[PDB]
Every structure is written in structure tokens, then in C-alpha cells.
Curated annotation (Swiss-Prot), chain A:
Interacts with nsp8 to form the replication-transcription complex (RTC): nsp12, nsp7, two subunits of nsp8, and up to two subunits of nsp13. Interacts with host TBK1; this interaction inhibits TBK1 phosphorylation and decreases by 75% IRF3 phosphorylation, which leads to reduced IFN-beta production. It comes from the Viruses. The chain holds residues 5325 to 5914 of 7096 of the full protein. This is Helicase nsp13. It comes from Severe acute respiratory syndrome coronavirus 2 (2019-nCoV). Changing E341D: In strain: Gamma/P.1.
Length: 590, 132
């Protein structure tokens, strides 16, 4: 269990204690880190403590060898030397410790709180290995934070599926959704056993909550639910593989006379084949899904696997491939939990397929020939290197868009994060530009593209279809009630319920609510197709209903609204409460 | 039509006579034990979705051997196919078959159970514990 250092990458086997991830450190490097930082614990083939039981000194600043063990000054034997090296820390291997000085950045990485944008932007500016370490330690910080969440001390249960929820006092009570995982523990002075993997979502109305779990008892009074965290695995592969140019094709099987929409893109495809990899910088709605389908149509011969960040995007991609590509050569890998529904029409996790699909957190450790991944704003730098390690192919394809919202990054609560700094790929794609760019959207008609180009985008965007004349708006405020986290604007729901009937082809209009409580209560009231922004995006729908509850940085986000409106096909109607934002667009007011 | 009968009758003889009516699901009155939140009990019920095809023998004499074929959703199709694939060794499981027919322009799933008995055990038990 020995390796190289991190700052100097010299052969060493010492690790710091206070640093949570405990990485390999050299003599001089670790010495400088403990001199600067308050880390006063070093791990080795044995711990560093005052061996004398009458002392409990763990500081590396003073610890004196008792011949074979470490001692303090009040316990140091005469014939013995302190093990604080000559401007270093005594340890294993000293004669081959190559020098490196850039420790202050690493010192700050292990010091900052990941609450200020400076932490995140600087973490995207360090060395590759430093970047991997920063990503892993941020992931661990997030896991530790979510572990220290509310313990739901309940008292009542309503039904075989409905229960009554209540929490303790002091720790953050997490919200309720299928993404979370909980488990009750029976406290009978013994048998504190797991009652099943429970996921929770709020009930319909009042103090009523729906409970669902892997097993299902009728829960008692004294139990509680704690959010557990999942471990973080170290990684080795680089986040980005190096680029190499070529002259001729890299061994791909083309299809002569296959289609027409992608013949104009064959030059782009061969440009991709000219390099080890290629990326995609284009605005959303440009049919980049169908563009990827046609790119596959160019060389649909090798045995390939694909993936996407979320489920809705990969399900839409599966449908698009089914529509274009032959069915019995593509598959979608599903997870064991599967608490979120998926494309329940294809092969159920058939890994032995020619064009496979999956999710980020369910990817296998196999290999392929080419690959594409959906969205870089949704992804960090950790998963990039993770898929770099588990999957190794000859060509890689990446897609993304600057105008999409980034990953949640809940710990970052101050300031705004620049789109180029969402990940390493974002900085690269904003620094060197696109590999190929497509700025025409087939989903939305002319009025929507004009509004998006005028308001948030650059005045460059265009479309192919004329206005559908289905533009409407409303402004009145409505009141909220401070529900779970945020609240719901119920009078708007009542007004929509009363009014909708006049709109004939809008019964299937996709209701939009980023807030889970409103997203559920809207379906509870009438049953419109419910949807949230994150579960949206990348796709497009004929009939959409947007609902803004109140005004706040979350709801007033320009990016949220613009990525929400890029999902209109033939008709849409949105409610809102902001004045200047209401004046901003160029549609019918009504 | 009759191609549906031909597909259902896969390999084992061909002595079928539809007790139902082509693609119509013949309805019967059979006993059941069921417990699911909304209801709970052990009583008689009306079975609906069962295309019963009694297999006869040589000289066209009828015998107790029924090919029940049922249609359901699509998720259930894969789920039951997987679980049966797990357990397809024990001699205690009735031989199954899975396919999708085209009654119309629809990919409707089908599940086939071969060489069954006219009455289950629940009917026999219920006939003795509720005698009249
Ligand atoms: Zn440290
Ligand atoms: Zn070092
Ligand atoms: Zn001591």
C-alpha cells in the first residue's frame, strides 16, 4: 500500500489525518502542509501518538522516538532523537523525494467550506489529480452533510400506504421524494433492525404522507427514519483524454444512401473521425438527439453503448432510436432500485446489445467502440473520469449547451457560477469553442426562437416554422402558505381549473412545476400532465402549461425560464407574477 | 382469427376446440381467495380475461386438458417471463409460453398455460366448506 505523492508525485507512503480523503503525501510536501494547515495528525504504517499511556499527544509538531515508539517531552528517553526531520517529516523514503512547492492551493482545497463560488471555481483550476481529489472530497462532504439530516420521529400512520410524519429538533429534515432513501428501525430495547428500504413522498392533502418501502409493515409510533449516505469510490482515469489528429478514417463501416438530413453532416462526422473524440456546442431544441441518431446512422455497424444523465432524456433518445434505428440492436440498462419509472417497452437491462443505453449511476465497467453522453451542465468532472475509467473506447462523443442549468451543487449558496466553470468541459468549450455547432431549432416556431434570441440568447438564433398563434399570458399574483420548503399558489390552480375547458386541445397540456408539492397537488386537483424542469429539458411537447408559484431567485432564474420555454412545439400557456419579466417577452398578454 | 388458434397451439398436438369465441374472453364463475387493501375475503367471483381452449383427443372426444391464454399489460409480460425463466426446472410449475399476437394493428401480449385442469383446488375446497 504505497504510491506516489500528489504535489510532487514522488514515491512515498504517508497520509494526512485531518484531511478527510487521506491522500498519499511525501516527506517535504506533508511537512509543508502540516506546517501551514492546522492538520496535526499523520497516518503511517502505525498511528502517531505519545506511546506512553500517561500522554495522548497526537501532534506531529512534537513526538519523540522511545527507541521503537513515539513519546512526548515529559516521556522522552535519554538515548533517543525527535522525529521532526530537517525541514521535513520523518517517514518512509527520504532520499528520492522530488521537490514541489504548489501546496497553498491544495492547502486551501482542504480548508475551504465549498459555500463560496471561489472554492468551486478554483477547484476547477488545479492539476488533474488535484481536480480528481477535489471532486472526490466534495462528494464526500456532500455525503456527510446528507447523512447529518433529520431523524423523522413519527407518531401516527394513516393507511397501509399512507402515514403521518414528524421530525426531531435540530437536524435538517430533508424533503420527500422518490430519489431519497430511508429506512425505519424498530426500537424494542433490542432488534434495531432495518424494516425495509423506504422512499417517501408527501400525501395528497392535510397532514397526510404516503409511505412506500421495499418491505411494508404498518409502522408503529416510536420508530424514525434516517437518511443514509453512499460511499465514494476513488478514481484514477483522467477527466479528459488527450487529442490526436489523423489523416484518414479510423476503421468505421459507412452506409451509402441511408438518409438525407445527415448527408450535410457527413463532413462533421469525418471531422470527428479525424480525431480521438469530438464535442458538441449548440443551443437546445436543435434536434441534437436526431442529429446523434443520424450520426449513428452514418456508422451503425460496431457494437456500441450510450448513456445520458437523467431518465427522461435517455427515454426520449430510446424512442428516437426506435423510430429511426432497428429495434433489436439497442437496449436500455435499468437499475436495481428503479424507483423512477423508465422506457418500459424495450429490453429489460440487456447488456448484450449493439447500441446500448443506460444511466450515469448504473453504467457497467465494459468497453465499446464509440460513445455519446447527454449534457455537460448536468454533469460534474467526477463522473467524466468515472466513465473514463470504467469504459474505454476508441472514439468519444460529447454534447452540451451553455444555456442549460448546471448541477445542483447545494453546498454552493453564494454568488452565481459561470457556465464555463460548470465543469472542465464547459471551460474547454467556452475557451476553444465548438467542435461543430448547430443553431436551428425544429421544436419551437418563429415567435419562441425570436423571444429567446432577443431576451437571453444572442440575436443569432433562427427557426423554420412560423407562429402557431397559441401565445397567452396571465399576471395576477395569488397567495402561498409556506408549505414544505416552498409553497403552492392555489388560487392560480383554481383559476386554471375553471378556465381550461374553453381550451379544447389543452387537456393533455404538460403542467410544469419545479416544486414537488405543487407538482403533486396540481395532479391531485384535476390531473393535468405534471412535470418539473429537471425532468423536462432536452425534449419537446406539443401542449405545455408553465406555472410560476411566487418570485424568488429560484423562480426568477433566467436560465430556468429559458430552458423551460425551449420545450414548446405547437402550443403553450404560462402563468407568472413578475412585472418586468411579464413585460420582457413579445407574446400576447391576455 | 384461426391464425390465433394456430399460434397458440404451438407444438403439442392440434386437437383444440375454442370454448370461448375466437378472440372473445369467455367469462366464468370461479372461487377465489384474495386480500388487497380494498377487499378481503374468500368467496366466489366472475373470471373475465380467459380464452379457454379445451383440448380433445383422438376421435375428437373431449378430455380434461385446457389451454388457458390470457392478455394483460406489457410490463407484466416481461416480469412474468423473467420469473418463469428463473423457475423453469422444478416439476411443480405448469409449462408456460409467451408471445404477442396481432388481433388488429396492436402488439398485444399473450401468456399461454398448457394442459391445465378445469377446476382449481380452491373450487374443490369451497364446494365442501360451503355445502348445500
Ligand atoms: Zn491534510
Ligand atoms: Zn510530495
Ligand atoms: Zn507523553
Amino acid at each position: 500500500a504505497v504510491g506516489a505523492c500528489v504535489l510532487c508525485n514522488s514515491q512515498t507512503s504517508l497520509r494526512c489525518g485531518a484531511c478527510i480523503r487521506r491522500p498519499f503525501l511525501c516527506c517535504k510536501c506533508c511537512y509543508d502542509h502540516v506546517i501551514s494547515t492546522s492538520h496535526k495528525l499523520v497516518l503511517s504504517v502505525n498511528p502517531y501518538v505519545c506511546n506512553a499511556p500517561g500522554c495522548d499527544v497526537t501532534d506531529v509538531t512534537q513526538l519523540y522516538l522511545g527507541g521503537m515508539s513515539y513519546y512526548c517531552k515529559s516521556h522522552k528517553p535519554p538515548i533517543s532523537f525527535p522525529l521532526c526531520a530537517n525541514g521535513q517529516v520523518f517517514g518512509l523514503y527520504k532520499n528520492t523525494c522530488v521537490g514541489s512547492d504548489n501546496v497553498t492551493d491544495f492547502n486551501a482545497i482542504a480548508t475551504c467550506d465549498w459555500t463560496n463560488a471561489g472554492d468551486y471555481i478554483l477547484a476547477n483550476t488545479c492539476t488533474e489529480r488535484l481536480k480528481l481529489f477535489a471532486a472526490e472530497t466534495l462528494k464526500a462532504t456532500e455525503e456527510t452533510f446528507k447523512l447529518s439530516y433529520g431523524i423523522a420521529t413519527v407518531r401516527e400512520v394513516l393507511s397501509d400506504r399512507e402515514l403521518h410524519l414528524s421530525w426531531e429538533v435540530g437536524k435538517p429534515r430533508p424533503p420527500l421524494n422518490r430519489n431519497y432513501v430511508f429506512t425505519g428501525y424498530r426500537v424494542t430495547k433490542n432488534s434495531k433492525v432495518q424494516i425495509g428500504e423506504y422512499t417517501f413522498e408527501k400525501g395528497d392533502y392535510g397532514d397526510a404522507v404516503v409511505y412506500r418501502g421495499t418491505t411494508t409493515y404498518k409502522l408503529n409510533v416510536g420508530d424514525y427514519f434516517v437518511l443514509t449516505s453512499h460511499t465514494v469510490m476513488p478514481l484514477s482515469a483522467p477527466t479528459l483524454v488527450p487529442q490526436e489528429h489523423y489523416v484518414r478514417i479510423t476503421g468505421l463501416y459507412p452506409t451509402l444512401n441511408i438518409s438525407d438530413e445527415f448527408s450535410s453532416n457527413v463532413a462533421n462526422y469525418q471531422k470527428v473521425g479525424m480525431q480521438k473524440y469530438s464535442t458538441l456546442q449548440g443551443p437546445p431544441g436543435t434536434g441534437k438527439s436526431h442529429f446523434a441518431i443520424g450520426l449513428a446512422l452514418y456508422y451503425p455497424s460496431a457494437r456500441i453503448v450510450y448513456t445520458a444523465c437523467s431518465h427522461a432524456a435517455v427515454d426520449a433518445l430510446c424512442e428516437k432510436a426506435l423510430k429511426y434505428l432497428p429495434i433489436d440492436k439497442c437496449s436500455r440498462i435499468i437499475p436495481a432500485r428503479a424507483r423512477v419509472e423508465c422506457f418500459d417497452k424495450f429490453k429489460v437491462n440487456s447488456t448484450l446489445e449493439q447500441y446500448v443505453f443506460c444511466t450515469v449511476n448504473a453504467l457497467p465497467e465494459t468497453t465499446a467502440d464509440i460513445v455519446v453522453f447527454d449534457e455537460i451542465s448536468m454533469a460534474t468532472n467526477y463522473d467524466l473520469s468515472v466513465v473514463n475509467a470504467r469504459l474505454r473506447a476508441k472514439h468519444y462523443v460529447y454534447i452540451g449547451d451553455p444555456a442549460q442549468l448546471p448541477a445542483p451543487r447545494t453546498l454552493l449558496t453564494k454568488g452565481t457560477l459561470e457556465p464555463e466553470y460548470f465543469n472542465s468541459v464547459c471551460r474547454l468549450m467556452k475557451t476553444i469553442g465548438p467542435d461543430m455547432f448547430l443553431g436551428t431549432c425544429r421544436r419551437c416556431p418563429a415567435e419562441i426562437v425570436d423571444t429567446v434570441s432577443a431576451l437571453v440568447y444572442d440575436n443569432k438564433l433562427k427557426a423554420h416554422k412560423d407562429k402557431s398563434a397559441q401565445c397567452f399570458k396571465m399576471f395576477y399574483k395569488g397567495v402561498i402558505t409556506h408549505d414544505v420548503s416552498s409553497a403552492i399558489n392555489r388560487p392560480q390552480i383554481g383559476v386554471v381549473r375553471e378556465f381550461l375547458t374553453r381550451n379544447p386541445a389543452w387537456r393533455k397540456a404538460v403542467f410544469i412545476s419545479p416544486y414537488n408539492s405543487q407538482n403533486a397537488v396540481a395532479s391531485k386537483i384535476l390531473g393535468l400532465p405534471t412535470q418539473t424542469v429537471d425532468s423536462s429539458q432536452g425534449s419537446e411537447y406539443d401542449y405545455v402549461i408553465f406555472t410560476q408559484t411566487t418570485e424568488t431567485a429560484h423562480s426568477c432564474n433566467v436560465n430556468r425560464f429559458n430552458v423551460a420555454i425551449t420545450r414548446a412545439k405547437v402550443g403553450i400557456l404560462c402563468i407568472m407574477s413578475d412585472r418586468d419579466l411579464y413585460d420582457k417577452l413579445q407574446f400576447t398578454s391576455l | 382469427a384461426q391464425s390465433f388458434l394456430n399460434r397458440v397451439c404451438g407444438v403439442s398436438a392440434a386437437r383444440l376446440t375454442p370454448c370461448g369465441t375466437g378472440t372473445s374472453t369467455d367469462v366464468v364463475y370461479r372461487a377465489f381467495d384474495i386480500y388487497n387493501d380494498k377487499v378481503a375475503g374468500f368467496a366466489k367471483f366472475l373470471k373475465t380475461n380467459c380464452c379457454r381452449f379445451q383440448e380433445k383427443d383422438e376421435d375428437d372426444n373431449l378430455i380434461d386438458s385446457y389451454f388457458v391464454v390470457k392478455r394483460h399489460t406489457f410490463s407484466n409480460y416481461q416480469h412474468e417471463e423473467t420469473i418463469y425463466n428463473l423457475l423453469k426446472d422444478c416439476p411443480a410449475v405448469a409449462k408456460h409460453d409467451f408471445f404477442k399476437f396481432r388481433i388488429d394493428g396492436d402488439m398485444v401480449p399473450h401468456i399461454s398455460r398448457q394442459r391445465l385442469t378445469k377446476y382449481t383446488m380452491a373450487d374443490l375446497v369451497y364446494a365442501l366448506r360451503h355445502f348445500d
